[PDB]
Amino acid sequence: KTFKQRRTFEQRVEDVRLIREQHPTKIPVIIERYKGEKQLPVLDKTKFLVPDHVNMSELIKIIRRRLQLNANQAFFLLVNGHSMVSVSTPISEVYESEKDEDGFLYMVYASQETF
Ligand SMILES: CN(C(=O)Cn1cc(Br)cn1)C1CC1
Ligand SMILES: [Cl-]
């Protein structure tokens, strides 16, 4: 069901190496609904190429637009398993400190802060 489950470490690593060659200015992000989540819908896709200059605040807005949420729905985004310390960091900076060993940046979203 989950991405890491669907693809071998060898396949996830090769996918990241190709995004580097074909989309060198993009951050390879896996965005996944929390396996618990009741309220928010699932995304149309799993794998996003994020322009490496957007900060985490703009990425939340993108995903809320993608889910077509409205003003008073709540949305929480974990990066690499934990809360974001700051939303003003450029995703290029976040990638270098929070990327997995396969080379993707893993994110999970839910409606409560208690995932
Ligand atoms: C970039 N972006 C997307 O819609 C995902 N995407 C674009 C290509 Br090209 C492939 N995937 C949003 C998250 C910032
Ligand atoms: Cl590019």
Side-chain angles (χ1 to χ4, degrees), residues 29-48:
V29 185
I30 304 301
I31 313 169
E32 275 182 323
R33 193 172 60 157
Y34 177 57
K35 73 181 296 292
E37 185 56 30
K38 288 324 190 179
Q39 312 319 316
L40 297 168
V42 301
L43 297 165
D44 45 295
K45 71 187 194 152
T46 305
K47 194 175 61 138
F48 296 81

mmCIF file of all heavy atoms in Angstrom, residues 29-48:
data_model
loop_
_atom_site.group_PDB
_atom_site.id
_atom_site.type_symbol
_atom_site.label_atom_id
_atom_site.label_comp_id
_atom_site.label_asym_id
_atom_site.label_seq_id
_atom_site.Cartn_x
_atom_site.Cartn_y
_atom_site.Cartn_z
ATOM 1 N N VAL A 29 9.846 14.533 -3.746
ATOM 2 C CA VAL A 29 9.055 14.459 -2.484
ATOM 3 C C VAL A 29 8.003 13.349 -2.632
ATOM 4 O O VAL A 29 7.328 13.292 -3.688
ATOM 5 C CB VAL A 29 8.433 15.825 -2.165
ATOM 6 C CG1 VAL A 29 7.713 15.829 -0.832
ATOM 7 C CG2 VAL A 29 9.479 16.910 -2.207
ATOM 8 N N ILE A 30 7.910 12.476 -1.624
ATOM 9 C CA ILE A 30 6.787 11.517 -1.422
ATOM 10 C C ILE A 30 5.827 12.137 -0.421
ATOM 11 O O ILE A 30 6.272 12.374 0.718
ATOM 12 C CB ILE A 30 7.318 10.162 -0.922
ATOM 13 C CG1 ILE A 30 8.373 9.566 -1.861
ATOM 14 C CG2 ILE A 30 6.168 9.197 -0.706
ATOM 15 C CD1 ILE A 30 7.881 9.333 -3.260
ATOM 16 N N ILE A 31 4.586 12.425 -0.826
ATOM 17 C CA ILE A 31 3.539 12.966 0.104
ATOM 18 C C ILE A 31 2.412 11.928 0.226
ATOM 19 O O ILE A 31 1.908 11.467 -0.803
ATOM 20 C CB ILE A 31 3.026 14.360 -0.306
ATOM 21 C CG1 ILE A 31 4.193 15.297 -0.631
ATOM 22 C CG2 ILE A 31 2.111 14.925 0.780
ATOM 23 C CD1 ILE A 31 3.799 16.602 -1.294
ATOM 24 N N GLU A 32 2.085 11.553 1.466
ATOM 25 C CA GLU A 32 1.262 10.369 1.815
ATOM 26 C C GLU A 32 0.261 10.755 2.901
ATOM 27 O O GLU A 32 0.613 11.479 3.837
ATOM 28 C CB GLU A 32 2.149 9.206 2.272
ATOM 29 C CG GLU A 32 2.679 8.388 1.110
ATOM 30 C CD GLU A 32 3.536 7.181 1.459
ATOM 31 O OE1 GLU A 32 4.319 7.261 2.436
ATOM 32 O OE2 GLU A 32 3.433 6.166 0.736
ATOM 33 N N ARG A 33 -0.973 10.297 2.767
ATOM 34 C CA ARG A 33 -1.956 10.481 3.853
ATOM 35 C C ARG A 33 -1.561 9.538 4.988
ATOM 36 O O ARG A 33 -1.120 8.397 4.699
ATOM 37 C CB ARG A 33 -3.384 10.232 3.380
ATOM 38 C CG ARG A 33 -4.400 10.724 4.399
ATOM 39 C CD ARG A 33 -5.828 10.679 3.907
ATOM 40 N NE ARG A 33 -6.259 9.335 3.555
ATOM 41 C CZ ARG A 33 -7.526 8.934 3.513
ATOM 42 N NH1 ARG A 33 -8.511 9.763 3.824
ATOM 43 N NH2 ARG A 33 -7.797 7.688 3.163
ATOM 44 N N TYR A 34 -1.670 10.027 6.222
ATOM 45 C CA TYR A 34 -1.503 9.242 7.469
ATOM 46 C C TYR A 34 -2.428 8.020 7.417
ATOM 47 O O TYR A 34 -3.615 8.187 7.061
ATOM 48 C CB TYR A 34 -1.820 10.123 8.670
ATOM 49 C CG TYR A 34 -1.753 9.398 9.983
ATOM 50 C CD1 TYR A 34 -0.593 8.752 10.376
ATOM 51 C CD2 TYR A 34 -2.848 9.370 10.829
ATOM 52 C CE1 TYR A 34 -0.524 8.092 11.588
ATOM 53 C CE2 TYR A 34 -2.795 8.718 12.048
ATOM 54 C CZ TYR A 34 -1.630 8.074 12.422
ATOM 55 O OH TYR A 34 -1.575 7.425 13.620
ATOM 56 N N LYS A 35 -1.917 6.826 7.740
ATOM 57 C CA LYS A 35 -2.645 5.553 7.481
ATOM 58 C C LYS A 35 -3.927 5.558 8.324
ATOM 59 O O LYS A 35 -4.893 4.905 7.899
ATOM 60 C CB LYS A 35 -1.749 4.328 7.710
ATOM 61 C CG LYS A 35 -1.428 3.995 9.163
ATOM 62 C CD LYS A 35 -0.510 2.788 9.347
ATOM 63 C CE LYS A 35 -1.094 1.470 8.873
ATOM 64 N NZ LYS A 35 -2.234 1.019 9.709
ATOM 65 N N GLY A 36 -3.948 6.320 9.429
ATOM 66 C CA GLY A 36 -5.140 6.562 10.270
ATOM 67 C C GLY A 36 -6.204 7.443 9.616
ATOM 68 O O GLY A 36 -7.398 7.131 9.774
ATOM 69 N N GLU A 37 -5.805 8.499 8.898
ATOM 70 C CA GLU A 37 -6.655 9.670 8.508
ATOM 71 C C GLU A 37 -8.086 9.268 8.095
ATOM 72 O O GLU A 37 -8.243 8.392 7.206
ATOM 73 C CB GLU A 37 -5.979 10.457 7.379
ATOM 74 C CG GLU A 37 -6.706 11.732 6.992
ATOM 75 C CD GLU A 37 -6.916 12.692 8.143
ATOM 76 O OE1 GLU A 37 -6.074 12.697 9.055
ATOM 77 O OE2 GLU A 37 -7.918 13.439 8.117
ATOM 78 N N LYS A 38 -9.084 9.947 8.683
ATOM 79 C CA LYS A 38 -10.538 9.756 8.417
ATOM 80 C C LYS A 38 -11.082 10.896 7.544
ATOM 81 O O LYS A 38 -11.820 10.588 6.582
ATOM 82 C CB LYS A 38 -11.308 9.646 9.739
ATOM 83 C CG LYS A 38 -11.089 8.345 10.501
ATOM 84 C CD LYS A 38 -10.926 7.139 9.586
ATOM 85 C CE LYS A 38 -10.951 5.806 10.301
ATOM 86 N NZ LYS A 38 -10.804 4.686 9.339
ATOM 87 N N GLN A 39 -10.713 12.147 7.840
ATOM 88 C CA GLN A 39 -11.339 13.369 7.260
ATOM 89 C C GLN A 39 -10.796 13.667 5.847
ATOM 90 O O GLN A 39 -11.599 13.614 4.895
ATOM 91 C CB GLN A 39 -11.145 14.555 8.212
ATOM 92 C CG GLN A 39 -11.491 14.244 9.666
ATOM 93 C CD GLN A 39 -12.740 13.408 9.823
ATOM 94 O OE1 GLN A 39 -13.761 13.647 9.181
ATOM 95 N NE2 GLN A 39 -12.669 12.408 10.686
ATOM 96 N N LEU A 40 -9.502 13.972 5.702
ATOM 97 C CA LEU A 40 -8.910 14.527 4.452
ATOM 98 C C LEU A 40 -8.937 13.465 3.358
ATOM 99 O O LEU A 40 -8.767 12.277 3.629
ATOM 100 C CB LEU A 40 -7.470 14.973 4.724
ATOM 101 C CG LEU A 40 -7.291 16.101 5.734
ATOM 102 C CD1 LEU A 40 -5.827 16.240 6.120
ATOM 103 C CD2 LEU A 40 -7.828 17.413 5.184
ATOM 104 N N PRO A 41 -9.117 13.854 2.077
ATOM 105 C CA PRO A 41 -9.058 12.892 0.984
ATOM 106 C C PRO A 41 -7.608 12.476 0.730
ATOM 107 O O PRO A 41 -6.709 13.111 1.249
ATOM 108 C CB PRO A 41 -9.635 13.633 -0.226
ATOM 109 C CG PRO A 41 -9.518 15.113 0.111
ATOM 110 C CD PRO A 41 -9.371 15.228 1.617
ATOM 111 N N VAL A 42 -7.422 11.420 -0.055
ATOM 112 C CA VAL A 42 -6.085 11.026 -0.577
ATOM 113 C C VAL A 42 -5.772 11.904 -1.791
ATOM 114 O O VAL A 42 -6.728 12.375 -2.433
ATOM 115 C CB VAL A 42 -6.005 9.528 -0.920
ATOM 116 C CG1 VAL A 42 -6.303 8.689 0.305
ATOM 117 C CG2 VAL A 42 -6.884 9.136 -2.103
ATOM 118 N N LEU A 43 -4.475 12.126 -2.051
ATOM 119 C CA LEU A 43 -3.941 12.863 -3.229
ATOM 120 C C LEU A 43 -4.099 11.967 -4.459
ATOM 121 O O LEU A 43 -4.169 10.725 -4.302
ATOM 122 C CB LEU A 43 -2.459 13.222 -3.028
ATOM 123 C CG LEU A 43 -2.105 14.164 -1.874
ATOM 124 C CD1 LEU A 43 -0.613 14.109 -1.612
ATOM 125 C CD2 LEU A 43 -2.538 15.596 -2.155
ATOM 126 N N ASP A 44 -4.141 12.589 -5.632
ATOM 127 C CA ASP A 44 -4.199 11.911 -6.951
ATOM 128 C C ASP A 44 -2.894 11.145 -7.205
ATOM 129 O O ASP A 44 -2.932 10.161 -7.956
ATOM 130 C CB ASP A 44 -4.508 12.925 -8.053
ATOM 131 C CG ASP A 44 -3.702 14.213 -7.948
ATOM 132 O OD1 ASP A 44 -3.893 14.967 -6.949
ATOM 133 O OD2 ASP A 44 -2.894 14.463 -8.871
ATOM 134 N N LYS A 45 -1.771 11.577 -6.625
ATOM 135 C CA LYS A 45 -0.453 10.923 -6.843
ATOM 136 C C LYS A 45 0.329 10.927 -5.528
ATOM 137 O O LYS A 45 -0.162 11.497 -4.518
ATOM 138 C CB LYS A 45 0.294 11.546 -8.034
ATOM 139 C CG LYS A 45 0.865 12.957 -7.884
ATOM 140 C CD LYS A 45 1.428 13.496 -9.206
ATOM 141 C CE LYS A 45 2.298 14.736 -9.090
ATOM 142 N NZ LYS A 45 3.301 14.797 -10.185
ATOM 143 N N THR A 46 1.495 10.270 -5.557
ATOM 144 C CA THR A 46 2.424 10.039 -4.416
ATOM 145 C C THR A 46 3.689 10.894 -4.579
ATOM 146 O O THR A 46 4.135 11.490 -3.584
ATOM 147 C CB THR A 46 2.808 8.554 -4.341
ATOM 148 O OG1 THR A 46 1.614 7.778 -4.263
ATOM 149 C CG2 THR A 46 3.695 8.219 -3.164
ATOM 150 N N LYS A 47 4.229 10.929 -5.799
ATOM 151 C CA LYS A 47 5.551 11.508 -6.128
ATOM 152 C C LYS A 47 5.440 12.881 -6.818
ATOM 153 O O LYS A 47 4.921 12.947 -7.965
ATOM 154 C CB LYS A 47 6.241 10.487 -7.014
ATOM 155 C CG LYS A 47 7.722 10.721 -7.184
ATOM 156 C CD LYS A 47 8.314 9.605 -7.966
ATOM 157 C CE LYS A 47 7.702 9.501 -9.344
ATOM 158 N NZ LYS A 47 8.749 9.237 -10.356
ATOM 159 N N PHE A 48 5.942 13.920 -6.132
ATOM 160 C CA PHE A 48 5.943 15.356 -6.530
ATOM 161 C C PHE A 48 7.374 15.802 -6.829
ATOM 162 O O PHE A 48 8.300 15.434 -6.059
ATOM 163 C CB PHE A 48 5.343 16.192 -5.406
ATOM 164 C CG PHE A 48 3.905 15.840 -5.174
ATOM 165 C CD1 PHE A 48 3.566 14.732 -4.417
ATOM 166 C CD2 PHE A 48 2.897 16.570 -5.782
ATOM 167 C CE1 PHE A 48 2.238 14.372 -4.245
ATOM 168 C CE2 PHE A 48 1.569 16.212 -5.606
ATOM 169 C CZ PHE A 48 1.243 15.108 -4.842
#
